């Protein structure tokens, strides 16, 4: 039942449902930001509480409710006379819509604080899920302070126009909802880690921040204009600011917000193609704001420049290494054929994402993950070497750990006859061929997964011939061999005496047969 | 007594009181900067020395003292006639306030030069505190030159309006106080090192620098305007510059400073929404200044971009390593379950600030601090291993030096039965459990501080069973083991023969019992 379910329920913060929940809370938070400030400053978003009265010349000049032709080409700004009921009779639908969305976002906040109440914390690697423990951890922490301050329903009594007590509402009392920024920061970071484009996403959330700052600065500009007085000088929004209200432009709520947003965009991006301040207070406001806009522009430039620098760092490092090679081959007077070979191979493995090293896995991962990855890649290929057929899998784990990559280019010789042989080669991503002394392919091409040199790695007596390679091997195209050194194999064998017995016996039997 | 105290007193420059003193000296220095230049250029900050006379049409046009309605909508700039006593009778209170603050800051300078006189210097690690020595070091150095030049009381005779000799003061003679910038630079660096936000603090002191430069450039703009003549053209402050003095704006000292600061902000940030120069000298000034403003804007952008690049360097490096791992696991065709395991573990220790290495302590600290830190973390946990109970603490210091961290993820196996055992594990930050061959937890979970494998690390004969693990151990959650290799223990033991005897005896006794 829902009773027992909500009685015993606890939350795990690392789920995929909890991430979606943090996204929902972020939606509610953005709602609060934008529309609390907008409803405070503009306050026609809920419907006008007052009636705009314009002085109109019909017979004679009288004061009547402004039409849209009275709000165009104004010679003075209209005056307002409140309604008896502060617009409630004719805008109750707009105000009920606003109340519904406020209640929806506060229900989101209540669900979020319930999930914080029953919140599983990580103790000794595990996530604790015993309710008693999570609620005790909640109460011992001071999360309930922030969860309660951010939900104080003060804006439901004093945030709306009450005509009985002649109270015209204070929508700014909902700014305590903006204290739950911790879950928004988590959602943004958990989205950055999941994003297939983290640099782009970082710059995108920065421009979202800048757009929200432009919105708040637009509201600040219009609040300062309304406090000073609209149409009083050529800087505040009004009829004397001929950029606010040009010739055939009507003074509407959309016009107020649109011009304020444009003004704020021009100021905070340091473009400044807006009217100059007139009064000392406007000069102070605009100076401070232009300094904030210099800092905002510098922040945008810095974030975009950091993104550009990060996304071109690998190419830069590759170019540095290639230029070092070029400079060396010029200082030491290297033949041009070898130089074009070097440059061809460099460009080849730059157009194939190779990095020439297992050092990423080696450095950054723990030995457990490194061993598991090496076992996945190399074990089933090292189980078919015909000397490792019946030896302990721990030996093969040790070996698959010590497998060194070697790359080759077309026509390169892996080994020539009469050439000390201290190695075993496992073919990946290529095709070798054994040749009769720079002649025709004699017997076989080595496709992927094949091995060559598995018997020149054991120290058997006499054999038939030295520690000399005895065969020619050249790559047809670009091969990617994996190399098992002799010292590494013999270390792993000194760790395993019975494996050494089996290996030596099988090698001797292979050579005799 | 104060006599003996000041006779024998010497100063240690590394105290917390001396840092507060450098902050006081920085306050005095900033006072000098701002208000010496402001009092030179504007010089109504001490009270007007002259009387502004306006041509006023009452009956007829006469020249009378300007009111505030005569300084609005001016058709020409007012003319000035000095007082007999240069405003002293009616502004002696303002001038006495200025004199008091000047004397206060010069007392700060005198205390500072006394502390420089009795200044303890660092000689052979210690701070010398013998007065004779510190005063001899002061006199042998040439600090007294700067301490004396910066305190020359020339501005007390020639810096104020003297009506007897018709001298109107030269407040710029106090610019020698601006030579003590060394203590200001120390205070700023000592505050940067103490600051919990060094990047933010660096950018903040840079914007303080920019605000001071804007202040000095505002004073320079108004001094050039006054030298050319006020109201002579449409670039200098005055009545022909309709941005300085719009319609209903009064010409006051506040207006002069406010407009000059706004002009300087627009010029030095390369916004340039100010009137164009009219004369060749104004063109030269504005060109040079706009070039300085280009450099200032580039400096702001560079500092903010450097702060942004520094504070996102760890995330960038982590992302580079994770992308390298992804690219490797795509090139080698790794199973997707292992890839989601790898990514989960990566994100886990990126959301826990782990860094997987003790290499910070290893690289950057001296062996003394490294040994002390390792002793604090590991000694009391290595004293309870039941083989290290009665062995020399030097052996255990050697050991706590060589303890390697190993991390594990939930369900990972630390060791399986029949698995070469060359190691000892010390549990931290996790909980293991021994299991009956992938079945149920058999006997015990290993909470933190527990040890496993302490007997598979000694080379005792026969024992009961090999060097084989003999037990299964898997982590319940994310465990953080500490690993004591066999080679390291046996090196530390070869350094200690008696410790080896005790260890082998106790191991044999443990196994027999
Ligand atoms: C989104 C839209 C939702 C549904 C309807 C929006 C109605 C658009 C306004 C109608 C024009 C009235 C007008 O024109 O503006 C005003 C002001 O009212 C408004 O702005 C209300 C705007 C918003 C209303 C409700 C929005 C609630 C939305 C919830 C927030 C969004 C949540 C995000 C989701 C999580 C009414 O003017 P008036 O004709 O009374 O005054 C002048 C008459 N003289 C000049 C001719 C004489
Ligand atoms: C936005 C909706 C666009 C409405 C377009 C047509 C309405 C119309 O066309 O009606 C407008 C009247 O105002 C309105 O009710 C529209 C209400 C929209 C007010 C915008 C205030 C928004 C504050 C929102 C915060 C936003 C967060 C943004 C963060 C970046 C009359 O139009 P008029 O001035 O073109 O001339 C008429 C002759
Ligand atoms: C800070 C404030 C400290 C206390 C008082 C400040 C008084 C404010 C000025 C009164 C308005 C007079 C006026 O309005 O401006 C002027 C100029 O005098 C001043 O500016 C003096 C400003 C500063 C005075 C003393 C400041 C000493 C502060 C020490 C520095 C701060 C140190 C930082 C701390 C380490 C007087 O004008 P008037 O009426 O004689 O001329 C026009 C008359 N017609 C037009 C109607 C005919
Ligand atoms: C600053 C104090 C604000 C005073 C506001 C009200 C005074 C007033 O309101 O009185 C002003 C008169 O000038 C004053 O004495 C105020 C003296 C302030 C002069 C500012 C010069 C400051 C140079 C300071 C260096 C500052 C370092 C800054 C570094 C970034 C009259 O006012 P009004 O022009 O508005 O019109 C009247 C009709
Ligand atoms: C730089 C200093 C700028 C001078 C600011 C100033 O003079 O105006 C004081 C304002 C009220 O001024 P007004 O609204 O009468 O023009 O009232 C206020 O100052 C509000 C407080 C913010 C300052
Ligand atoms: C006023 C200027 C502040 C603009 C605000 C832009 C902003 O908030 O983005 C900050 C970004 C990095 O943010 P984050 O990575 O900490 O989430 O980049 C920054 O941290 C730079 C902000 C500091 C500017 C001074
Ligand atoms: C670029 C060169 C710009 C030309 C400068 C110039 O012509 O004017 C010389 C000024 C005096 O000029 P004015 O005050 O008579 O206009 O007198 C001075 O030049 C002062 C010295 C600084 C130059
Ligand atoms: C004229 C442009 C000079 C602007 C002055 C801004 C400034 O002084 O800040 C300098 C900062 C670093 O200063 P600091 O770290 O040496 O204290 O950053 C710089 O060093 C850049 C100043 C050099 C600009 C050329
Ligand atoms: Na312009």
Curated annotation (Swiss-Prot), chains A, B:
Residues 270-273 are annotated as: Selectivity filter. Na(+) binds at residue 273. One of its GO terms (molecular function) is protein-containing complex binding. It is a multi-pass membrane protein. Changing residue 301 to A: Impairs activation by cGMP, likely by disrupting the central gate. Impairs activation by cGMP, likely by disrupting the central gate. Residues 112-145, 182-202, 306-513 are cytoplasmic. Changing residue 315 to W: Cytotoxic; traps the protein in its active open state even in the absence of cGMP activation. Residues 46-91, 160-170, 226-256 are extracellular. Its main location: membrane. Residues 387-501 are annotated as: Cyclic nucleotide-binding domain. The chain crosses the membrane at residues 23-45, 92-111, 146-159, 171-181, 203-225, 257-279, 280-305. Keywords: Cell membrane, Cell projection, cGMP, cGMP-binding, Chemotaxis, Ion channel, Ion transport, Ligand-gated ion channel, Membrane, Neurogenesis, Nucleotide-binding, Transmembrane, Transmembrane helix, Transport. It comes from the Eukaryota. The record marks 297, 301 as: Central gate. 3',5'-cyclic AMP binds at residues 454, 469. 3',5'-cyclic GMP binds at residues 453, 456, 469-470, 513. GO terms for biological process: aerotaxis; calcium-mediated signaling; chemosensory behavior; chemotaxis; detection of carbon dioxide; detection of chemical stimulus involved in sensory perception; G protein-coupled receptor signaling pathway coupled to cGMP nucleotide second messenger; monoatomic cation transmembrane transport. The keyword Cell membrane applies. Pore-forming subunit of the cyclic nucleotide-gated channel. Required for normal thermosensation and chemosensation sensory behavior. Required, downstream of receptor-type guanylate cyclase gcy-9, for CO2-mediated responses in BAG neurons. Required, downstream of receptor-type guanylate cyclase gcy-14, for alkaline pH-mediated responses in ASE-left (ASEL) neurons. Involved in the development of ASJ sensory neuron axon during late larval stages and in the maintenance of normal axon morphology in the adult. Regulates dauer formation. Belongs to the cyclic nucleotide-gated cation channel (TC 1.A.1.5) family. Homotetramer. This is Cyclic nucleotide-gated channel. It comes from Caenorhabditis elegans.
